[model samples]
Target: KLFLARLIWWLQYFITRAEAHLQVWIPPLNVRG
Candidate 1:
């Protein structure tokens, strides 16, 4: 549980950051917004 918790949190952060940057190059993929 502990490992999964950290992994999800980190993954969420990375995904959010990556998406933000990705928007510049791939606006169409931002459909999740």
Candidate 2:
């Protein structure tokens, strides 16, 4: 089960990393008039 836990951990790590790393992509392009 250790390997499974590690795999889950890596998945979370990459997701968080992607969210942080891709911060600009989520930035506000919201003001469409």
Candidate 3:
């Protein structure tokens, strides 16, 4: 049961890393054409 919990924690950490990468790819823009 403890090991399963650890895997879940790691999955969350990986998701955070993916979010960081997505943020880098998508930047904020205020100018509209």
Candidate 4:
């Protein structure tokens, strides 16, 4: 149970990071046109 909770916490953290990264990375690529 504790392990599962830790896994879920990390999953949420990584997903949030990935979304922020995409938002930061994608706009410049679009503007390059």
Best candidate, TM-score: 3
* Candidate 3 lDDT over residue span 1-33, tens digit each: 554666788899999999988887664784685
Per-residue accuracy of model 4 over 1-33 as CA lDDT, tens digit each = 544666788899999998988886455545645
Best candidate per lDDT, number?
3
Candidate 1 — which residues are off by over 4 angstroms? 1-3, 26-33
lDDT of 1: 0.76
Q: After superposition, how far is residue 6 of candidate 1 from its true place, in Å?
A: 2.9
Q: What's the CA RMSD of model 4 in angstroms? A: 4.4
lDDT of 2 by residue, 1-33 (tens): 544666787899889988887887674777676
Q: lDDT of all the models against the reference?
A: 0.76, 0.77, 0.79, 0.75
The C-alpha TM-scores of every prediction are 0.51, 0.47, 0.57, 0.51
Arranged by lDDT with the best first, the candidates are: 3, 2, 1, 4
lDDT of model number 4: 0.75
List clashing residue pairs in candidate 2: none
lDDT of 2 at 12: 90
Backbone-clash count (model 4)? 0
Which of the two candidates, 3 or 4, achieves a greater lDDT against the reference?
3
Indicate the residue-level lDDT of 29 in model 3: 88
lDDT per residue for candidate 1 within 1-33, as digits (tens), equals: 444565777889989999888768755665766
Task: Return whichever of 2 and 4 wins on TM-score.
Answer: 4
Each model's RMSD to truth, in Å? 6.5, 3.2, 3.4, 4.4
